[PDB]
Design a protein around this ligand. Sequence first.
Ligand code: ADP
Ligand code: PHY
Ligand code: MG
Ligand code: MG
Lengths: 347, 360
Amino acid sequence: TKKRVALIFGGNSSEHDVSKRSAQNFYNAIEATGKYEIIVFAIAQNGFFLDTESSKKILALEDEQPIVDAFMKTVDASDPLARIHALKSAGDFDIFFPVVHGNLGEDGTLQGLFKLLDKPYVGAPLRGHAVSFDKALTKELLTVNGIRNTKYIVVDPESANNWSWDKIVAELGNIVFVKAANQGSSVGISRVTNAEEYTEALSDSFQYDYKVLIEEAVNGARELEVGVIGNDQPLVSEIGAHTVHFQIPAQLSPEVTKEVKQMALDAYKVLNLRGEARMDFLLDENNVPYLGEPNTLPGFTNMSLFKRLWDYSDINNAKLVDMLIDYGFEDFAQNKKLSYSFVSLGE
Amino acid sequence: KKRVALIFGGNSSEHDVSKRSAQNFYNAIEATGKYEIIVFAIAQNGFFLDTESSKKILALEDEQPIVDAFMKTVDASDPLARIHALKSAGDFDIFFPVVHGNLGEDGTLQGLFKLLDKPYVGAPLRGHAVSFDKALTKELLTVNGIRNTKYIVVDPESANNWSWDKIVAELGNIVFVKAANQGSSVGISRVTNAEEYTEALSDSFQYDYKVLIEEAVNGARELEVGVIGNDQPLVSEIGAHTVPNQGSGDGWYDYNNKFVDNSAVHFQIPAQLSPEVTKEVKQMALDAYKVLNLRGEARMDFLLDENNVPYLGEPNTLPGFTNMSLFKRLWDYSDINNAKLVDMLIDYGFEDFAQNKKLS
Ligand SMILES: Nc1ncnc2c1ncn2[C@@H]1O[C@H](COP(=O)(O)OP(=O)(O)O)[C@@H](O)[C@H]1O
Ligand SMILES: C[C@@H](C[P@@](=O)(OP(=O)(O)O)[C@@H](C)N)C(=O)O
Ligand SMILES: [Mg+2]
Ligand SMILES: [Mg+2]
C-alpha cells in the first residue's frame, strides 16, 4: 500500500523449484496484511537476475526455460553488472525479502549485495548464514559453546591422509557420516560403516569442497524441528516430532521439551542468526537431544513444517511475515548508530 | 592484456590507510608488465566512483571536492546507484580488493564478486566474515587448541554484570577492551582502573554491539607473519616490532603509533627468537589459516609473554601494504619481491575461481 518489498526467489541450486513454491506462500502472506507493495524478482539457474515481468510468470509456475531464454537475448555481455541489472528494471524499493533456497541465499552472498546497496532486508546477516551454511564451522562454534551435537573430525586433501578407517573408529565409532563442508541438500553425503566405503566416500565428498567433515552417527530415529524468530529477544516455536508426518506439539517429557527449546535459542545466538531460523535435532534412544543443522531460510511450501509451526503459537502467515519485516527494519535501524569514523591521515 | 579491478577506500575507519596500500599494490602490478589496471574508489558514503575521479583520489588529491562533483551526477531513484560506477570503464577480468575494514574484510565485497561471477584475489566470503569478528575468531582458535588470550565477550546488557572487581578477579588489573568487528586499533583501549574501564566500554560500544574484554600479555614485543596460497600455503619469515614502554610500561601499538607517527618503533626481520618458538609460531599461523578458511593472502599477528610464550593475537585477511607495513617487506626474504607477490596472488585468485567451477 506504500512500503515496497522486493521478494527474491529462484537460485542456481538443486532446490530451484521448491523456491517458487515458498515465494508464493510468502507473497500471499505479505499481500494479506495490506501494508506493503510486492515487487518480485527471480534468479535463473544460470545466476542472472530476471525483470519483474518475467519473474511474475515464473512465480505463477509457467514453463520457466522459454521465459529465461527470451530474457537472455536482451542481456549485454559487455556489462560487468549484467547479472544484477534487472534489479533496477522496476525502480526503487524499500526492503529485500530473500527466499532463494541454496547456494545464494543461505551462504551469505546475497546479503553482501544488500549491505552494499544500503537497504534493509529480512533474515540473518551474511555472517550467520556463512557460519550456518558451512558444516564444519557450525559444529566448531556449537562445541566450544557447550551445545550438544555429535563428535566430529575435519579433514582436507592432505590431512585426510593421516586418517585411516581404524583411527576414525577410535575417535567417532564404526558408523560415521562423511560430507563436504560447503554444499547443500544432497551430494557429498555418505553413510560409512567400513574402510571400503570410507575410502570412496572421501573421493566423492572431495568433489564438492576441499574441506570434508566426518561425524559419528546418532543411533536413535526421532527427528525434532523447532522454529525461532526475532533479534535481541527471540521467540521459539513449539516442537515438531516425527511419528513427512509431523506431530505438534512434540510429545516429549516436560524436561526434554525445555532443553530442546533452550538449545535452539542458545544456538541461534552463537551462530549469529537474526530474523528467522529452524533448528533440527536428533533424539537418541535415551531421549538425549543433539542439535543437528541450522536452517537460515526454511521452506514455506504447502507441505513444509515452517508453514504451520507458528499456528500453534497463534501466529498466522500474515502476522508471521509482518513480524519478519518489522525485525528486518529494526536491525537496519540499529546498525545505523554504528560509527565508521577515523582520524584523517597525511604525509 | 588481462584487466585488474583495483578497488580501494570504502566507508571505513581505515579508509586513509587503504590509499597508501593501494598506490603500492598499483605499482607492484604495473611492474609485472602483464596486466592492465582500472582503479575504483569507494567514498565514505559507500558510493563507488568512476575510474577518472578515482585515479585522482589515488594521486592523493583532495577527496570531498572530487566526491561532491560526482554526487551531482547520481540518479537517486536507481537502487543500484552505489555500484553503478563499476561499469563506467567496460569489462574487466579479476578483482583486487584493497579496501581495509568495513567492506573488504567483512565479506561484503566478496558477496558482490560472487554475484557478478568474476575471479578475485584474497580469501572467500566466509573467511573474512569469520576473521573480522574478533569473538568468532577466538572461538575457532580455542576449539582447535591454538593459544590465544583469556577473554570474555559481552553486549550492552551483558556488560552491566561485570563490575571492575569481577573483571580484575577474572583477568587481572590490566585488560584490553575492544569492539568485535574493527581494525587499525580503533575502538580499542588499554584499561588499568575502574574509570578507564567504564569509559572504554562506552567507546567500544559505538563501533559494534559486541565487545571483547581480554587479559593483557605483558610481553615487550609483537610478532607478524605473512601467509599466502590456497591448498598448499607458504609461510614467510617472522617479523617483529616494539613501541617505547611496551613491556616495562603502558605503551602499545595504537592508531597513533601505526599511522600517525611510526618513526619511534623498532622492527626486526627475522625476529630474534629461539628455534623452538620460531617453529611454534609458523605452525600456529599455518593451522589458523586453514581453520579460518582463508585463501590467497593473510598476515597473522602474535603476542609474546614475559617467558616468550606465543599467543595468536589476530588474523588480517587484507593486510596493509604501506611503506611501514610488514606484509610489504617480509616476502622479500623468500625471494618474492612485491612484483612476484602480486603475480602469485593473482594466479591464486584465478586458480581458485577455476577450481570452484569444477566443484559443482
Ligand atoms: N590481549 C592483549 N594483550 C596485550 N596487548 C594487546 C592485547 N590486545 C591488543 N593488544 C595491543 O593493542 C593492539 C590491538 O591489536 P588487535 O587486537 O589485533 O586489534 P586491531 O584490529 O585494531 O589490530 C595490538 O597491536 C597490541 O599492541
Ligand atoms: C600496522 C599494520 C596495520 P593493519 O594491517 O593491521 P592491524 O589490523 O593489526 O592493524 C591494518 C591495515 N589492518 C600494517 O599496515 O601492516
Ligand atoms: Mg586487525
Ligand atoms: Mg593487530
